[PDB]
């Protein structure tokens, strides 16, 4: 705290910088947009230590890491004032903003969930939105009082704000996974246009239990309806009826393909592991396929599969760290784009595609000239899912034929009674997060 800690930038503009002061701790850290970007700064404290990219590049921002040791060195020596090295994030400030903004206004009043925006061809983490947040200048205090009574208050805050909910905190995915499912199905060798239920109502293999459609209506006024029909209008009968032709096992194989049940690599920042559940029985599998019973993910991990479709079938590798740079920004380091995996063929990424720009079809916050693919979805959740009001899902890419941002927006308990999907409020946050990243 002697020494002047380096910066974390984003699009060029400082999300943490430090300030030279009066402090016996001469060094004051200071976060100009503090709550937006909690979830990327995190906090760097007197007496917590340091959370989020403070913590992960700890080493370049306090100028003790080996790359930057010949400086530190040349600087002793020379008499000239140390300085530590920069944080170039991937964030676009416009685009965090944005999401912000629409978390803030989007639930009448402020949402709590997450933003993830990623650019699909690369992997850059374009947006990291996590609400409600707080304010790290907080534990920034070099008044240890200050900081146990932040401490504490956010520590006994039921809302828990300083829960990073884009990475570290898993939800039921809900409708979105019918994404998976229908991967699954296509990959097996399921087509489009088969017919499905169109049932109101699907009893649960081997229990009491019965699975409805969402509002308890009838996909439509036919005894079946298409693959793709069921999917535009998401019906939850359809999905249960497919998921268990398709199988357990293959659904296992798709939401693995899709980097569930595989521990994330760090972005630095560490991201909790997503599961699709080990499926113990039928009943399980036909829940499991509408993203219900054990399947838990991430938001990030939703916005992934969003813009691994929207990449070809092509998972990038997702990343926050843009660069590391010097006291006097001369290079150190420069993230290169790894392609991790391949989901899924071409073909299906293709299908799947189609599917979710019918999806987004069947309208706020649209936007002109731009082919939005999407899919909007509820998801029940806690120990009394049938009373609790369930979150709301949009995850989304554009534009749909060249994709240049994916999405994944969580509205925790946003859950619509009216709307098609009963998602509807996460949908308009999602559109402005594109809009911002598109214009």
């Known amino acids: 705290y002697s020494r002047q800690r380096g910066q974390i930038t984003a699009g060029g503009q400082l999300l943490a910088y430090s300030v030279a002061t009066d402090g016996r701790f001469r060094f004051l850290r200071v976060y100009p947009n503090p ?8 906090f760097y404290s007197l007496r917590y230590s340091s959370t989020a ?28 004032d140390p300085r530590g090295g920069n944080v170039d994030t991937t964030i676009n400030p416009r685009i965090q903003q944005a999401g912000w903004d629409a978390m803030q206004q989007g639930c009448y009043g402020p949402c709590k969930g997450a ?20 304010d790290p200048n907080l534990l920034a205090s070099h008044n240890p009082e200050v900081q146990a009574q932040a401490w504490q208050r956010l520590g006994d805050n039921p809302a828990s704000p300083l ?17 998976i499912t229908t991967a699954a199905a296509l990959a097996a060798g399921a087509t489009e246009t088969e017919q499905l239920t169109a049932a109101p109502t699907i009893p649960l293999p081997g229990s009491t239990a019965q699975l409805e459609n969402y509002g308890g209506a009838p996909c439509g006024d036919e005894p079946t309806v298409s693959l793709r029909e069921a999917f535009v209008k998401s019906c939850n009968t359809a999905f249960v009826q497919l998921g268990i032709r398709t199988g357990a096992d293959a659904l296992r194989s798709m939401a693995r393909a899709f980097g569930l049940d595989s521990p994330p690599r760090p ?14 029985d039928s009943a399980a599998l036909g829940m499991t396929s509408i993203g219900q019973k054990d399947v838990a993910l991430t938001p ?3 916005a992934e599969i969003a813009a691994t479709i929207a990449n070809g079938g092509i998972t990038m590798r997702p990343y926050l760290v843009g660069s590391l740079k010097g006291p006097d920004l001369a290079n150190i380091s420069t993230t290169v784009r790894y392609q991790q995996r391949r989901a899924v063929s071409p073909q299906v990424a293709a299908k799947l595609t189609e599917l979710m720009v019918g999806a987004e079809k069947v309208q706020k916050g ?20 049938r009373h609790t009001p369930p979150h ?17 927006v969580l509205v925790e308990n946003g859950a619509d009674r009216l709307s098609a999907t009963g998602g509807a409020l996460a949908a308009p946050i999602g559109r402005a997060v594109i809009e911002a990243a598109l214009q």
């Open 35 to 42: 709550e937006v970007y909690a979830p990327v700064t995190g």
């Open 53 to 80: 990219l403070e913590r992960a590049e700890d080493p370049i921002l306090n100028g003790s890491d080996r790359r930057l040791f010949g400086r530190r060195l040349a600087d002793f020596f020379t008499g000239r």
């Open 115 to 134: 933003v993830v925006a990623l650019e699909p061809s690369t992997g850059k983490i374009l947006a990291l939105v996590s609400s409600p947040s707080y």
């Open 163 to 179: 829960t990073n909910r884009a990475i570290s905190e898993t939800y039921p995915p809900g409708s979105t996974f019918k994404v």
């Open 267 to 280: 972005t630095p920042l560490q991201v909790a592991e997503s599961t699709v559940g080990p499926i113990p």
């Open 300 to 302: 990030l991990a939703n």
């Open 366 to 385: 649209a936007i002109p000239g731009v082919q939005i693919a999407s899919k909007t979805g509820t998801a029940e959740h806690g120990t009394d899912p």
């Open 392 to 408: 709301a899902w949009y995850i989304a890419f554009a534009p749909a034929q060249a994709p240049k941002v994916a999405v994944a």
